[PDB]
Amino acid sequence: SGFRKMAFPSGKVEGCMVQVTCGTTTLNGLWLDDVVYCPRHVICTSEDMLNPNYEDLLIRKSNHNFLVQAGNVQLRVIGHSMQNCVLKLKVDTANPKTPKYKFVRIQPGQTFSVLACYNGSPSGVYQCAMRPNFTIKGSFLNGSCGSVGFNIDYDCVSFCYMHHMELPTGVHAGTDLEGNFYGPFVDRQTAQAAGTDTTITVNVLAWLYAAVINGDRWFLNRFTTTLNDFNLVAMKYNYEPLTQDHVDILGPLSAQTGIAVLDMCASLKELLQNGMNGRTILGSALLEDEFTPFDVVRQCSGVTF
Amino acid sequence: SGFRKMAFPSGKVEGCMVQVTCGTTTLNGLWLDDVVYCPRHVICTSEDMLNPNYEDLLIRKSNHNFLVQAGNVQLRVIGHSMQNCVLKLKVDTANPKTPKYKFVRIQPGQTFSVLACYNGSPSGVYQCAMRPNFTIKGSFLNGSCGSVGFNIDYDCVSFCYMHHMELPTGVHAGTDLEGNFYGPFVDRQTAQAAGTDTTITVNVLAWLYAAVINGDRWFLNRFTTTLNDFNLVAMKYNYEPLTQDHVDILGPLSAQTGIAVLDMCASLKELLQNGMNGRTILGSALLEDEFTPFDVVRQCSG
Numbered sequence: 001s002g003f004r005k006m007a008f009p010s011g012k013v014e015g016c017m018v019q020v021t022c023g024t025t026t027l028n029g030l031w032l033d034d035v036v037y038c039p040r041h042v043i044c045t046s047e048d049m050l051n052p053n054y055e056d057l058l059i060r061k062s063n064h065n066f067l068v069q070a071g072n073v074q075l076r077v078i079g080h081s082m083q084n085c086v087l088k089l090k091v092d093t094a095n096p097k098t099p100k101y102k103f104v105r106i107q108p109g110q111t112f113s114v115l116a117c118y119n120g121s122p123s124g125v126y127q128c129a130m131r132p133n134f135t136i137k138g139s140f141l142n143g144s145c146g147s148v149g150f151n152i153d154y155d156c157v158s159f160c161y162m163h164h165m166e167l168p169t170g171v172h173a174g175t176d177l178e179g180n181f182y183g184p185f186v187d188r189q190t191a192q193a194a195g196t197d198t199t200i201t202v203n204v205l206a207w208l209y210a211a212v213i214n215g216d217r218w219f220l221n222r223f224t225t226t227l228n229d230f231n232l233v234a235m236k237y238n239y240e241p242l243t244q245d246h247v248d249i250l251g252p253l254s255a256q257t258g259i260a261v262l263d264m265c266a267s268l269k270e271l272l273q274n275g276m277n278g279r280t281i282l283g284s285a286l287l288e289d290e291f292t293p294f295d296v297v298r299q300c301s302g303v304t305f
Numbered sequence: 306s307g308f309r310k311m312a313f314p315s316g317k318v319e320g321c322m323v324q325v326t327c328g329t330t331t332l333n334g335l336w337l338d339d340v341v342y343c344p345r346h347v348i349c350t351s352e353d354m355l356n357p358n359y360e361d362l363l364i365r366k367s368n369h370n371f372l373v374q375a376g377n378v379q380l381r382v383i384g385h386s387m388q389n390c391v392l393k394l395k396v397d398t399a400n401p402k403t404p405k406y407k408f409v410r411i412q413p414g415q416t417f418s419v420l421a422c423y424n425g426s427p428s429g430v431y432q433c434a435m436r437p438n439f440t441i442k443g444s445f446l447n448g449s450c451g452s453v454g455f456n457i458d459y460d461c462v463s464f465c466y467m468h469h470m471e472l473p474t475g476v477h478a479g480t481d482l483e484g485n486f487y488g489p490f491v492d493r494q495t496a497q498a499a500g501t502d503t504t505i506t507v508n509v510l511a512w513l514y515a516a517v518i519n520g521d522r523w524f525l526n527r528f529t530t531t532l533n534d535f536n537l538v539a540m541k542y543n544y545e546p547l548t549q550d551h552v553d554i555l556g557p558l559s560a561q562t563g564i565a566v567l568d569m570c571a572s573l574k575e576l577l578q579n580g581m582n583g584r585t586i587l588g589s590a591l592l593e594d595e596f597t598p599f600d601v602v603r604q605c606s607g
């Protein structure tokens with residue numbers, strides 16, 4: 001029993017964290033094979049960050065300008081190239097701790113674990129969701145840039161995020177491991193604002209199934225709804241529309257608990273229109289949306305890595 | 306900015322997780338140097354359930370009865386001994402991934418990361434607090450026994466918990482790494498009940514300081530209180546009494562935010578009286594008590 005926000009074991013990723021220094025800027029890099037990946041803004045000064053020409057800045061850099069440190073060993077940079085907003089530093093040594101990995105771009109609503117680092121040293125691991133507005137509600141201080149988001153599939157690390165910046169509202173923006181930002185963000189010191197956030201509906205439903213699996217049933221009701229009627233109500237409360245794909249992925253939980261997806265949707269509909277009435281679900285007074293249907297199955301069935 | 310429930314990176318602990326099998330029971334062990342630590346209840350059969358005599362059961366076991374598996378390598382048990390509720394299996398190989406470590410017994414309110422394992426394989430990492438009633442509100446299925454709780458301050462792993470059992474209410478009980486249980490619990494299937502849980506008051510205050518550091522100030526008020534008046538109100542909401550030690554540990558946060566401890570205590574009294582009025586503090590509609598004063602400083606200041 002029990003339900004917790006659970007991150008993937010971070011060991012396979014800790015073996016890849018290195019420190020990258022360029023001039024006065026120090027941030028984190030991901031050392032996979034003979035390449036170190038890090039945000040390209042490591043090459044920026046104060047004037048540069050305001051209106052940067054990264055192609056122009058990188059062309060002026062030499063390999064000896066980048067100081068890469070893996071533990072207490074300096075790695076020698078033998079090449080540099082840029083792929084979108086990520087800088088790729090070719091090193092002479094292949095990381096012997098390189099796990100089986102893949103670079104994956106995730107969709108909003110999907111979850112992943114974040115290994116927060118400072119000076120190439122991992123300090124914390126937390127689980128979070130890629131918000132529908134493409135920000136992550138992370139916990140990052142200055143120096144955390146280059147920290148990565150990942151999932152583990154069997155024994156394969158799927159790298160899906162690299163931290164680049166903090167928006168004025170305290171939320172965070174970053175890119176996939178190919179340098180493409182999630183969201184309408186740019187890596188420059190400029191007025192940027194995250195769009196209005198919405199609730200990840202399929203995740204709330206998955207978390208309601210986790211509550212039923214844990215014996216919390218007070219919110220269940222006799223009612224069912226149509227997917228269209230549910231979406232009309234949910235959109236009114238800033239909830240993401242639920243697609244047929246979401247109903248399908250919720251199938252195993254629906255079969256395990258004996259509560260159809262549209263039956264759980266009628267409970268969610270009532271929870272939205274009437275509130276929780278001083279009651280809690282899994283010790284929470286708010287509907288949780290950072291557990292996907294796969295996360296709930298993985299936790300309530302004990303899948304190991 | 307931002308505030309999250311954050312676990313320590315689990316890598317240093319993953320390299321120590323092994324699978325221990327005795328008869329039909331399979332659980333997890335912690336392989337440090339040439340010793341594998343695991344709950345002693347791995348030696349229990351269906352008859353040694355309510356009233357097992359572990360000294361008697363262990364004496365009947367031979368080294369070849371314990372099957373230790375580290376990945377796809379069977380480790381050879383060359384000795385066995387019991388220290389309280391933990392079994393120590395001496396193996397013929399020192400774990401090369403053994404980190405710098407220490408065994409630490411924690412107090413209620415202390416937080417730690419849990420590496421939940423099944424069959425010696427880590428499946429997730431989450432963050433816990435030792436509840437004032439000595440249970441932990443974990444997430445564990447059958448087979449999770451032997452999973453460990455830890456803190457990583459600097460290069461050193463402080464092992465503070467080993468999972469042994471699930472109480473009838475879904476909460477969990479375990480021991481430190483010397484086999485001493487936290488709480489009035491025994492490793493028997495006899496009727497056991499956790500005492501009524503209470504909120505870790507010093508941790509809520511630490512979390513309110515984290516919210517102020519993150520710009521959430523709506524709950525602040527012009528009031529201060531005496532420590533005694535605050536404790537009288539808090540106790541009515543099943544909150545732990547706040548001691549002078551707790552006021553002292555909250556000193557740095559009080560200095561950083563400019564809000565005295567007793568001033569924040571008055572804000573906490575008001576929150577207990579009114580509720581949140583549809584507002585959240587750090588994205589939460591309930592007062593969070595699983596962040597210690599030390600966690601808040603580490604996460605907010607660095």
Ligand SMILES: O=C(Nc1cncc2ccccc12)[C@]1(O)CCOc2ccc(Cl)cc21
Pocket residue numbers: 041140141142143144145164165166167172186187188189190306
């Ligand atoms: O956001 C940044 N860094 C941080 C990233 N995460 C969390 C933080 C928390 C506290 C301070 C800084 C943080 C910047 O390096 C600072 C200046 O503005 C930009 C603008 C664009 C870019 Cl791509 C980076 C940065």
Ligand SMILES: O=C(Nc1cncc2ccccc12)[C@]1(O)CCOc2ccc(Cl)cc21
Pocket residue numbers: 001346445446447448449450469470471472477491492493494
């Ligand atoms: O609680 C146990 N195991 C579990 C431990 N964690 C989580 C679980 C979840 C679902 C079922 C079982 C769980 C026992 O091994 C069996 C039951 O009685 C006792 C009694 C005493 C002891 Cl020291 C262990 C156990």
